[PDB]
């Protein structure tokens, strides 16, 4: 009953958050087994950000130039390397709170929980989504670098994101846990374009399905639409084109509500062209696109 | 950078979640020290909900009629009592994961994080607020009874809420950790009125202050307003009347943005009478009222 944008329980991730201090720069790290992961720009000063040569910058750094603080217990650094944009600091002591984990590169449109670490410690948790421009609309202040995005399958944590930078628009960019940036972004202080931020169409349909389950039906229309004609009005409104795969993913919601996928797309076409006229759907006046169909299925059962 | 409705890290609360099974009814409990707290309606069947005499119902129950499951370790019940609407089950083993905690009755308008326990285990976390009608707009399915609301001050957990029922409107009602319901609600299956759900005015002003800090200023107007004249247009739009205390709480945001409180109320008056004209503030077309001024201060520093 009721629909909320809830995140996974961050208990398994809080036990892996550490502080990495290189010189005067500090940020958060991920302590899994005997390796600490953090953005490689921790080794840069206020000047190096404009044009950093991370290879030349890391060469002048040694193992002892890294302060890894886990609450109060310091970790001895026995090795370091650079995998793309992530810094892998091998420590002596393995984390006893290491959960079952794996690394995964998340596709645009998929959601994940973010443990935002303000003021040098786990401070908040929220649910967000990977936008088509490979940016996220989150909440990151100074000291939030190293904040990780993750998903939890029963007992396994799927770490997928690590925050690095904020675009001049205010949106955020980051990498996966193997160092590769999501999008055409590079860890360097310079004006970078994000690109057109289209709307995840399959997530919007999943949110409309969640509205029917929760009682809101005013938007249910008396029309239908084909797949190509819906995509015609989709490109005009900066919506991603719907594919037959997206129809298959929305399978369980169509069978649970008795509303076919193409009928739901027909309704969505009317909301784009006519607006909501001030009305609300699930307490919002905007088509929400931060709910994957798997998130709706999880919460509605 | 960026504004999100983030919740506190639920790591300290997950270690206190247990399953309480009385007969065929199961729900979640709060294992603090050697006491387990849960809604007292766990002892009711499907029929007792219509007209329960909890005293007569609890008399026919003994210590062994309560299955307290903490993951896999069962807890031996050595005592039980009824404090208003909460069931205090004294167990033999004290919870080793018991954090520094205390109980607090939250005032309407204040926010707190909720660890929603779907399917018999901690499943999600979200931030919500106590509405003026003492209800909350959350996400609670069957088996969510026993889900707790809490706030975290550095190391101390302030447990303030426990979910019990859902109103026929879909909104949720609950009690504090001493058993007293928030509002005129009673644990009994019968049509109960929630009352007029006014808008927390001080929270809306705090959200507008957060919009100025984040760059959105289109709503900043060129007028001012007194306190009594703003309350005149406040009652018309189902907004709570602003008091001089509310002005004092908004102190830090006015001194940080250089915008006086009465000037911010002047802007808010224009949004109520003219709407947003389809525009957005912090990515929303509705005046958000689930951010206390302390939440904005926490996230904007
Ligand atoms: C806009 C800015 C000029 C700051 C820059 N932006 C671009 O370079 C862009 F234009 F490409 F975005 C940027 O983000 N950084 C500068 C530099 C990293 C990152 C950075 O130091 N960030 C802060 C470090 N703790 C955390 C931020 C600050 C506020 N809130 C946060 O979370 C790197 C790209 C290597
Ligand atoms: C609407 C209903 C008739 C169900 C009733 N409502 C009213 O009695 C009211 F009209 F007062 F609201 C109600 O909530 N309950 C019946 C009964 C308790 C509660 C209840 O058994 N709840 C479920 C138990 N696990 C969890 C719910 C179900 C869906 N999602 C949830 O979270 C008590 C008031 C003692």
CATH number for region B15-175? 2.40.10.10
CA nearest neighbour of B166 among A2, A25, A236? A2
Count Cβ atoms below 10 Å from residue A20 Cβ, excluding itself.
27
Q: How do beta strands B156-166 and B148-153 pair? A: antiparallel
- CA distance readout (Å), A226 to A95, A108, A254, A272: 54, 25, 16, 16
Dihedral angle, C-alpha A210, A212, A214, A218, nearest 10 °: 130
**Distance between CA atoms of residues B198 and B240, nearest Å:** 6
Question: Which residue of chain A has the CA closest to B141?
Answer: A1
In the DSSP assignment, the letter for residue B239 is B
| C-alpha span between B292 and B290 (Å, rounded) | 7
A53 contacts: CB under 8 Å, gap ≥ 6 = none
Q: Provide the 8-state DSSP code for B43.
A: G
Residue nearest to atom 9 of ligand 1 (CA): A167
Q: Any idea which residue has 């100025």 for tokens?
A: B212
* Sheet architecture: strand order including A86-91: A73-75, A67-70, A17-22, A25-32, A35-39, A86-91, A77-83
Of B52, B122, B134, which is closest to residue B85 (Cα–Cα)? B52
Decide: A167 in ligand 1 pocket, CB within 6 A.
yes
CA A246, CA B271: separation in Å to the nearest integer?
38
Q: Which residues, 6 or more positions from A56, have their beta carbon under 8 angstroms from its beta carbon?
A: none
Residues 6 or more apart from B225 whose CB is under 8 A from it?
B262, B265, B266, B269
- As to burial, measured by CB atoms within 10 angstroms (0-12 exposed, 13-18 middle, 19+ buried), residue B168 is exposed
Distance of alpha carbon B235 from alpha carbon B201, whole angstroms: 11
Give the CA distances from residue B163 to residues A110, B46, B171, B178, in Å, rounded to whole numbers and listed in that order.
30, 18, 11, 13
Look at residue B229 and give its three-state secondary structure.
helix
Pairs across A and B, CB distance < 8 A: 133
A16 among known catalytic residues: no
Token couple for A216: 């809101």
Neighbour tally for A139: CB within 10 Å: 23
Nearest CA to ligand 2 atom 23: B142
Surface-to-core class of residue A3, CB atoms within 10 Å of its CB (0-12 exposed, 13-18 middle, 19+ buried): buried
Alpha-carbon torsion angle B174, B177, B183, B186, nearest 10: 60
Q: Is the CB of A1 under 6 A from ligand 1?
A: no
Tell me which chain B residues have a C-beta less than 8 angstroms from the C-beta of A157: none
- Measure the CA–CA gap between A141 and A124, rounded to whole angstroms: 12
CA–CA dist A33, A92 (Å, integer): 10
Q: Tell me yes or no: is domain B201-299 CATH 1.10.10.10.
A: no
- Compute φ and ψ for A237, nearest 5 degrees: -105, 20
Query: Cα of B252 to ligand 1 centre, how many Å?
Result: 26
CA distance A261 to chain B (A): 25
Using CB atoms within 10 Å of the CB of residue A277, give its burial: 0 to 12 exposed, 13 to 18 middle, 19+ buried: exposed
Our CA angle for B162, B163, B165, nearest 5°, is: 145
Task: Please count the other Cβ atoms lying within 10 Å of the Cβ belonging to residue B197.
Answer: 14
Contact B2 A280 (CB under 8 A): no
List of chain A residues whose C-beta atoms are within 8 Å of the C-beta of residue B145: none
Are residues B14 and A12 in contact, defined by beta-carbon separation less than 8 angstroms?
Answer: no
Q: How many secondary structure helices (H) and strands (E) does chain A include? A: 8, 13
Tokens at A18, concatenated: 């550490």
Is residue B227 classed as helix, strand or coil in its secondary structure?
helix
Q: How many CB atoms lie within 10 A of CB B199?
A: 18
Say which experimental method was used: X-ray
Which residue spans of chain A are classified as CATH 2.40.10.10? 11-175
Provide the terminal-to-terminal Cα distance of chain B, rounded to the nearest Å: 10
Strands (E), B46-180: 67-70, 73-75, 77-83, 86-91, 100-103, 111-116, 124-129, 148-153, 156-166, 172-175
**8 A C-beta contact, residue A209 and residue A216:** no
Min Cα distance B4 → chain A (Å) is 6
Phi, psi of A50 (to 5 degrees): -75, -35
Is B224 buried (19+), middle (13-18) or exposed (0-12) by CB count in 10 A?
middle
H or E element that contains B296: helix B293-299
Which of B189, B193, B194, B195, when mutated, tests ligand 2's pocket best, judged by the most ligand atoms within 8 Å of its CB? B189
CB-CB under 8 Å, A1 with B139? yes
CATH number of A11-175: 2.40.10.10
Quote the CA–CA distance of A137 and A153 in Å, as a whole number: 24
- Sign (positive/negative) of CA torsion B274, B280, B282, B283? positive
**H or E element at residue A21:** strand A17-22
Specify burial of residue B269 (Cβ count, 10 A radius: 0-12, 13-18, 19+): buried
Q: Where in chain A is the domain with CATH 1.10.1840.10?
A: 201-299
For residue B111, the tally of other CB atoms under 10 A from its CB is 21
The secondary structure element, H or E, covering residue A151 is strand A148-153
- Residues 6 or more apart whose CB falls under 8 angstroms from that of A268 comprise A201, A204, A205, A208, A230, A287
DSSP result, B243-275: -HHHHHHTHHHHHHHT--HHHHHHHHHHHHHH-
| B62–chain A nearest CA distance, Å | 32
Question: Distance between CA A19 and CA A31 in Å, rounded?
Answer: 10
* Residue A286: partners with Cβ closer than 8 Å, 6 or more residues away: B280, B283, B284, B285
Do residues B203 and B297 make contact, with C-beta atoms less than 8 angstroms apart?
Answer: no
| Cα-to-centroid distance, A2 and ligand 2 (Å) | 13
* Cβ–Cβ below 8 Å for A299 and B140: no
């Amino acid at each position: 009953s009721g629909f909320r944008k809830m995140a996974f329980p961050s208990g398994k991730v809080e036990g892996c958050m550490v502080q990495v201090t290189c010189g005067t720069t500090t940020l958060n790290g991920l302590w899994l087994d005997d390796v600490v992961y953090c953005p490689r720009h921790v080794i840069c000063t206020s000047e190096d950000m404009l044009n950093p040569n991370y290879e030349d910058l890391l060469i002048r750094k040694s193992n002892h130039n890294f302060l890894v603080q886990a609450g109060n217990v310091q970790l001895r650094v026995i090795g370091h390397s650079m995998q793309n944009c992530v810094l892998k600091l091998k420590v002596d002591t393995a984390n006893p709170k290491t959960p079952k984990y794996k690394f995964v590169r998340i596709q645009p449109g998929q959601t994940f929980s973010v443990l935002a670490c303000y003021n040098g410690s786990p401070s908040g948790v929220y649910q967000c989504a990977m936008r088509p421009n490979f940016t996220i609309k989150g909440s990151f202040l100074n000291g939030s670098c190293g904040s990780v995005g993750f998903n939890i399958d029963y007992d396994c944590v799927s770490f997928c994101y690590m925050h690095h930078m904020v675009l001049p628009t205010g949106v955020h960019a980051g990498t996966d846990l193997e160092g590769n940036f999501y999008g055409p972004f590079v860890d360097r202080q310079t004006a970078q374009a994000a690109g057109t931020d289209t709307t995840i169409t399959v997530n919007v349909l999943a949110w409309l399905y969640a509205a029917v389950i929760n009682g809101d039906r005013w938007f249910l229309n008396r029309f239908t639409t084909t797949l190509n004609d819906f995509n015609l009005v989709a490109m005009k409104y900066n919506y991603e084109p719907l594919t037959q795969d997206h129809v298959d993913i929305l399978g369980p919601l169509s069978a649970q509500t008795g509303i076919a996928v193409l009928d739901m797309c027909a309704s969505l076409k009317e909301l784009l062209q006519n607006g909501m006229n001030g009305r609300t759907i699930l307490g919002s006046a905007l088509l929400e696109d931060e709910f994957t169909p798997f998130d709706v299925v999880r919460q509605c059962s």
